[PDB]
Each structure stands twice: as structure tokens, then as C-alpha cells.
Write an enzyme that holds these catalytic residues in place. Structure first.
Site, PDB file in Angstrom:
ATOM      1  N   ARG A  10       0.805  -1.242   0.000  1.00 54.98           N
ATOM      2  CA  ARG A  10       0.000   0.000   0.000  1.00 54.98           C
ATOM      3  C   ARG A  10       0.842   1.300   0.000  1.00 54.98           C
ATOM      4  O   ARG A  10       0.376   2.346  -0.487  1.00 54.98           O
ATOM      5  CB  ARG A  10      -1.037   0.016   1.147  1.00 54.98           C
ATOM      6  N   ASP A  30      -4.525  18.182 -14.755  1.00 56.66           N
ATOM      7  CA  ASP A  30      -4.971  16.871 -15.219  1.00 56.66           C
ATOM      8  C   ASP A  30      -4.620  16.708 -16.697  1.00 56.66           C
ATOM      9  O   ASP A  30      -5.168  17.406 -17.552  1.00 56.66           O
ATOM     10  CB  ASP A  30      -6.457  16.679 -14.947  1.00 56.66           C
TER      11      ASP A  30
END
Lengths: 393, 396
Positions: free
Chosen positions: B59, B184
Site C-alpha cells: 500500500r 490533469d
């Protein structure tokens, strides 16, 4: 009319005949779904059919995983996410807003604690820690702000248990939602929803997968609550999307869950009985020892005492260090619920940064080591702990 | 000389990997493992203190993810990369990390639906202040800046109209006032546009789209400075989101990236031909493609993008009506929402995504009733021309 747990863990929600006879369900490793007409498209972006639109939602292999987990937990609906942290952040981000309070068990998985205090808690949400077995301390902790009650049972470090039915009784007086992290027990050993909880979360990374090769999260609960967590927490707040590949591998893991947990428990039962008699060992925490403070409540909630053991070495940090280093079959790793046995010693590993006093306020003893007992032959596991105890002196 | 940077295609295939460090394996082995172990509790201790380099738990870090990350970093020209479970994973982990109650984020005028929802119904409901501005109007942006302004966040080109912003101009304004610029970059990929080289602090990707290219995975990427990406990894991802990328999917992502330059050349060459053909058809009232002089921001597009992309938006003569007919008549393009797949996609928001409404409306968001968006794929261009030709006729 009502098939056994093992039957459902293998079969529930799937009939090969509906999918060209395939015994194992095909894996929908696809990002996107298409529509036969635009009229068909229009129906998906409001909702009426229970179909499929875009793998960040509506993937059939995820759908099967969710239904199966919901069946095993005895709940209305399931949700599959990219990790146990994904399951819990999605849940809590959707249930809480600034000014709401969440009541917490006194101890929590590390990253969960970090999320609460350094994440959502920094966004105006209130946090209170309380002992979830002390029903009078809980009732007195309830406030009009209290909206969520969240805890693990059993909980690190000392395997402290909560009284789930009692918590639920108190929550229902105040309309509060009870969320239980059931990672340790799995639905095979404990089913919190059948005991009054509204939602259960799982790090499926651990026992559910059982083999150490995926990260995954599960949420099970009432349909209204699960829908919102899907459409808000997961879709908008987190993007913790579970790979269909990992989902399939998780289901493969779940088909042996009953078998693996019987063996995890039987292995841990002997090691605990051994450890409790050893001179290097001042204290043990294992639900299936007669000496376990909440032995009775344990037996009420869990059908078996589980695969985890915590214990404290006479001799503090140095004994712990010596014990950990000598191990040859157990691996030094964080994590639990794999086929391979694992051990950790927090005072010299996860919590070595702080010093003796800060580890105390968290209930982390200097000699505390925690075992995730695996599926190896116990004689091999026994020998390994034995020589390691010899090395710790 | 050897201080020369390898070409983009070379780096997309090789950067950060030498087979000799893994027993000569030509393709890196896939680290499908949740956890990593320690030789001693000291080497283990040193890896929660910041002394030794290594691996805690999948993780936080994992060698398959690490290679994907270093490689995406190289391609964007950034210091450090981070791989996540989806584009929204990238966006939410970045924003949750950078923003606290009282902070303001300035936003491009339009956004991807789930980004908009995240901002307005998610982080915006937790004390974070939102304001939209036209990132093409540098004067308006400058005027919107306040001492609370903490992040400036936009897509370029933006969903859904392909509106563009001057990345370098936004960066210059941001550096004078002190805001972090997040871009983005999904539509372009680093092959077409590198916002970090233009002064952005961070870029986010839905790698689900062109980076992957084959529509079989969901993934997100963040690239930027070592300090910011570390913070996002250790707070956003690890605590606030848990949007962990499967190592299996990350290997698949790397497999996609080995052909990125090749696929993008073809998406653009196909969309250029489609767009010029559509500009000349009786039924087409209006068309937006950044490679056409009629594109309102033609000049900004050709300054920022090496090529004009694989997305086309165009309005049909007729209304809602004519879309349905066109859409339902398509045999090769798929009716679907998404983009950057090998296969060609079409959507008619009127009769699809935004069908819950009426002829009125959507104006609120500013969307036409004959507007169709195409994600042009990699099929033979003659078959794609033939499919839209026969479908335009049906739309009459």
C-alpha cells in the site's frame, strides 16, 4: 432452503449455466461497458435495471464478490474496494461531515488511527476514544453530535473485545450507525451484523485472501447505506477501485476460508497453550485461554478464538529484539492472515522511533510481540518459537 | 556524448530497468505480494526511520509500482511518480493532501463529472472553498487570487468542450502569489504535452485511458516534485484514500506505455482525417477539433500540444432527435463513455449521460442538444469514415 457457509463460500450467486457452462466465473477485466441503443444508455445514468455501466462501478466479477461476501456476513449488500483503508475511508467519508462526532475503540489499526487524527479529524470531524466493552462509559460518551461508532473486535494490541450487541442497543437510542472492522475474525468466526451492527468493514488483504498476494477491502451492510458509500465515498471521494483480477483471486481465496481458519485456530490454540507456560513470558493475550479477561464475551461473539496471539516477554525491548532475530520459520513482517506465519515486535519495529513512555500511552509494551499463526505444521512452528525463546534470554 | 537524454520511445520501453538486476528477465517480474519481510529488526527499524532504502508494505511502496512510477516521472519530466487505483484515486489523494478547511481552490470552468462531484459534494462540504474561473483568461485568474488560494486545478484540454488554458501563464501567476498548480493531463498524455516542463507543480492522469490504451485496467498516476509526491503517497494514498494499484494492473499499464508514442500517432492521424471530413458534411453544423483552424483556441493548442489529440466534438443539424438517429446507426464506433481505447467510442450526452433532463437545461453546464463526442480509435480510417458517413445519412 438455507445452504451451509462452505457451500455459499463456493457457490453463492453463480450458476455456470448462465455463463456458457463455465465452472469458474469469467473475469471481466474491462474498464468500460457499451450500450445496444442510446435508450439503453439513458436508463443507466438514473437507475432502474441493475445492469452495468463503468468498472469504477457495475463490474460483474466485482458484483459476484460483493454478493458472496454479503451472503457470508448475513448482510443486504456488499462493496469491493482496492484496500481495507479504501473500505474504511470510503465508509467514513460518506457518513461524516464537519461537526459530527465519531466514537472510537481505545486502540486501532495504525493507519486507521492516522486517518482519523491526521486526515478526516483535520477536516472538522470530532473524535472520542472510549472502551467499547464498558457500556456505561459509552452511554455517558454519547452526544447529539455522535453519528458513528467505530471499532475493531478483537483489537490490537491486547485482543480487547467490544460488546457489539450492547454497543448496538446504545447506538439505536441515539440513531447512531455502528461500524465494525471484522478483519481478525472474518465472517466465518464472527458476524457483527447479526449482532446489531449496521456495517462491517474488512481488509480482505488478510484472512479473506489468505495468501498474501492482493490488497483488497470489503464493506457489507444495509442496501441504502452501501449504495451511498458506493456512489459517494468510492466513486467521488476515494477512487479505491478493486482490480477485477484481484477480485477473482480474492474469491478463489474465499473458497477455502472455512478450512484455513480451522487450521489457523488449531495452530494458534497449541502455540498459546505452549507460550502461557513459558518462563520468558510474563503475559499472553489469546481469546481461547481460560485466563483471557473477556473469555466469556469472546465465546459469545466468536465461534473460535482465532489465529492471532499477543504476548509479552520478561526482559523488555532487548528480549523482543533477540526473539525476533532468531526466528527462522516465522517471518519478521507486518501483516497477518497469510499461509505463512508472521511475527512483529512493535517496540523495535513499527514503533521504534518513539521511546519507552510514548509507547505506553498506546498500550504498546516494551516486550510485546504479536504472532500471526499460519498454516505450517505446528511441530515446525513450535520448534521455531522454542529456539527463539532460548535466544531471547 | 552520453549526457544526452534517450528518446521518448527508448525511455517508455527501458527507463529504470536493467534485466541484469533480475537474473536477466527481459520483462520485469510482477511483485504480486501484499507484504515484504525484514532480515533483522534493525534493518526493519531503519526503514521506519528514513535511513535505509527499501519496502514496508505494498500500500505504501512495491518494486512493480516503483518502476511504473519512475518511468511515468521520466516521461513527464518530473522528479517522482505515484501509481494509484484510478484517475479519481490520483485526484482525490492529491487534493485531500494539499487542502485543509479555510483553503480555497481555483478551478477550471468545466471538469470531468466525478471531479466536479468530488469538489462540490465531497471536499467542498468539509470547509474547503471553491471558485471557478476561466483559465484561458489570465487577467481573470490573476484577479481571482486571494491569500487563501492554495491550489489551482484544471484539465487541459478540459472535459467536455476541449477548452484550453495557458499552462505557463497560470504557472507564472501561481509563482507570484504562492499557489500549487495541479494539471490533469489525461487527454494529451506526456507524449503530447508536459505541463511540468511548462511550470506546473503536479500532474494527474487517469491512466485508465490512453496510457493503458486497451481499456482493460483502471489506474491513476501523479507526477511532480519528490517532496509533494512523497506527501501525497504518505497522506492522501496511505491514510485518506487507500486507492492502491494492483501490481498486476501496473504491469499491464507498463505494457501499454511501451506503445504509447505509436498509438497516439495513430489516434491523432485518424482524428485529423475524421475531423476534416466532418467539417465538410451537410448534416454537421459545428465541429471542435484542435487541429482545425476553426478551433476557438487553435493557437494555444498548437503552442502546448505537439499533436491535436484523438477527441472530436461536433453538433448535428437537427436536435436531440438527430443524435439518437446517428448514435443508434453507428456499427463500428461503440456507444460508450470513456476515451483512449483501441476501439472507437461515441457518446451523445443529450440522449445518454444527460437524458434525465429536458430540452432546456444543461445550458447550466453549457451542452448542446446535437452535440456528439468521439474518441477516435485505431481502426482502419476508411472503415471509420464509412461508419460515420452511413450514420450521418440515417440522422437525416
Amino acid at each position: 432452503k438455507l445452504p451451509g457457509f462452505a457451500t455459499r463460500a463456493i457457490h453463492h450467486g453463480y450458476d455456470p449455466q448462465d455463463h456458457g457452462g463455465a465452472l469458474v466465473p469469467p473475469v471481466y477485466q474491462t474498464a468500460t461497458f457499451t450500450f445496444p441503443t442510446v435508450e439503453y444508455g439513458a436508463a443507466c445514468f438514473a437507475g432502474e435495471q441493475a445492469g452495468h455501466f463503468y468498472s469504477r462501478i457495475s463490474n460483474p466479477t466485482l458484483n459476484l464478490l460483493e454478493a458472496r461476501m454479503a451472503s457470508l456476513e448475513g448482510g443486504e449488500a456488499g462493496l469491493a474496494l482496492a484496500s481495507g483503508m479504501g473500505a474504511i475511508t470510503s465508509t467514513l467519508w460518506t457518513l461524516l461531515r464537519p461537526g459530527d462526532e465519531v466514537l472510537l475503540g481505545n486502540t486501532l489499526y495504525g493507519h486507521t488511527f492516522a486517518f482519523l487524527h491526521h486526515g478526516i479529524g483535520e477536516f472538522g470531524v470530532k473524535l472520542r476514544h472510549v472502551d467499547m466493552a464498558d457500556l456505561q462509559a459509552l452511554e455517558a460518551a454519547m452526544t447529539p453530535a455522535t453519528r458513528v461508532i467505530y471499532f475493531e473486535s478483537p483489537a490490537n494490541p491486547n485482543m480487547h473485545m467490544a460488546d457489539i450487541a450492547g454497543v448496538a442497543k446504545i447506538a439505536r437510542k441515539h440513531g447512531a450507525t455502528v461500524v465494525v472492522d471484522n478483519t481478525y475474525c472474518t465472517p466465518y468466526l464472527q458476524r457483527p451484523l447479526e449482532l446489531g451492527a449496521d456495517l462491517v468493514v474488512h481488509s480482505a488483504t488478510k484472512y479473506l485472501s489468505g495468501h498474501g498476494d492482493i490488497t483488497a477491502g470489503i464493506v457489507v451492510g444495509s442496501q441504502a447505506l452501501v449504495d451511498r458509500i458506493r456512489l459517494q465515498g468510492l466513486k467521488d471521494m476515494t477512487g479505491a477501485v478493486l482490480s477485477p483480477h484481484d477480485a477473482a483471486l480474492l474469491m478463489r481465496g474465499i473458497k477455502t476460508l472455512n478450512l484455513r481458519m480451522d487450521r489457523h485456530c488449531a495452530n494458534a490454540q497449541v502455540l498459546a497453550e505452549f507460550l502461557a507456560r513459558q518462563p520468558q513470558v510474563e503475559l499472553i493475550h489469546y481469546p481461547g485461554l481460560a485466563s483471557f479477561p473477556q473469555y466469556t464475551l469472546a465465546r459469545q461473539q466468536m465461534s473460535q478464538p482465532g489465529g492471532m496471539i499477543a504476548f509479552e516477554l520478561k526482559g523488555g525491548i532487548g528480549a523482543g529484539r533477540r526473539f525476533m532475530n532468531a526466528l527462522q520459520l516465522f517471518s519478521r513482517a507486518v501483516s497477518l492472515g497469510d499461509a505463512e506465519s508472521l511475527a512483529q515486535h512493535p517496540a523495535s519495529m513499527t514503533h521504534s522511533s518513539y521511546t519507552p513512555e510514548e509507547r505506553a500511552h498506546y498500550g504498546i509494551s516494551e516486550g510485546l510481540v504479536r504472532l500471526s499463526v499460519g498454516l505450517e505444521d505446528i511441530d515446525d512452528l513450535l520448534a521455531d518459537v522454542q529456539q527463539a525463546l532460548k535466544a531471547s534470554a
